[PDB]
Design a protein around this ligand. Structure first.
Ligand SMILES: C[C@@H]1O[C@H](O)[C@@H](O)[C@H](O)[C@@H]1O
Ligand SMILES: [Ca+2]
Ligand SMILES: [Ca+2]
Ligand SMILES: [Ca+2]
Ligand SMILES: [Ca+2]
Ligand SMILES: [Ca+2]
Ligand SMILES: [Ca+2]
Ligand SMILES: [Ca+2]
Length: 182
């Protein structure tokens, strides 16, 4: 079965084709089995240089989560991650504020809540609010990629109208939606 841990299910995919947008990365995910799996328990990755998909840059980027890699991917020019699972959120209003190079998309309960559909050097976007109607574990997924060069990915979330933001980590993540005791 699907292991229960305090994190999202992570998949890494590399390619020697150019990633320009969300569609390109999603097509890469659809095209093959993941080059590596991991547990995404502390979703604040990077920053680094000289291509995420080369050498040990992925390990450096994933940091605290890299010890759960299923393998050490070989070199590629371009690469990214697909995260999916659950996040505990009380009913209320929230918004993401994301620092990234290159682009990304986060969905909650199937609906996009933070999107950058293009390549970019590091930039921080404060995204529009969204609502949670019922307290509990919410479905969440994320994609992020690097087309080359520098790389960073730090989604943060606010519950208090943008006064404070937190990283999504083992305090509130669940791989399956069951309560983790890990
Ligand atoms: C679009 C930008 O291109 C630059 O050359 C890269 O160094 C940045 O990391 C980013 O991907
Ligand atoms: Ca796949
Ligand atoms: Ca490697
Ligand atoms: Ca780190
Ligand atoms: Ca670790
Ligand atoms: Ca959708
Ligand atoms: Ca590229
Ligand atoms: Ca880049």
């Amino acid at each position: 079965p699907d292991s229960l841990f305090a994190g999202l299910v992570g998949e890494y995919y590399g390619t020697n084709s150019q990633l320009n947008n969300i569609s390109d990365f999603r097509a890469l995910v659809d095209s093959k089995e993941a080059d590596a799996t991991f547990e995404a328990a502390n979703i604040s990755y990077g920053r680094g240089s000289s291509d995420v998909a080369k050498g040990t840059h992925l390990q450096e980027f994933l940091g605290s989560d890299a010890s759960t890699l299923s393998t050490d991917p070989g070199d590629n020019t371009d690469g990214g991650i697909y995260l999916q699972g659950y996040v505990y959120l009380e009913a209320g209003t929230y918004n993401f504020k994301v620092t990234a190079d290159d682009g990304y998309e986060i969905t909650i309960n199937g609906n996009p809540v933070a999107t950058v559909d293009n390549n970019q050097s590091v930039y921080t976007v404060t995204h529009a609010s969204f609502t949670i109607s019922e307290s509990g574990y919410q479905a969440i997924d994320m994609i992020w990629w690097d087309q080359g060069g520098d790389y960073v990915f730090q989604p943060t979330l606010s519950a208090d109208g943008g006064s404070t933001y937190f990283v999504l980590d083992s305090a509130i993540l669940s791989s399956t939606g069951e309560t983790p005791y890990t």
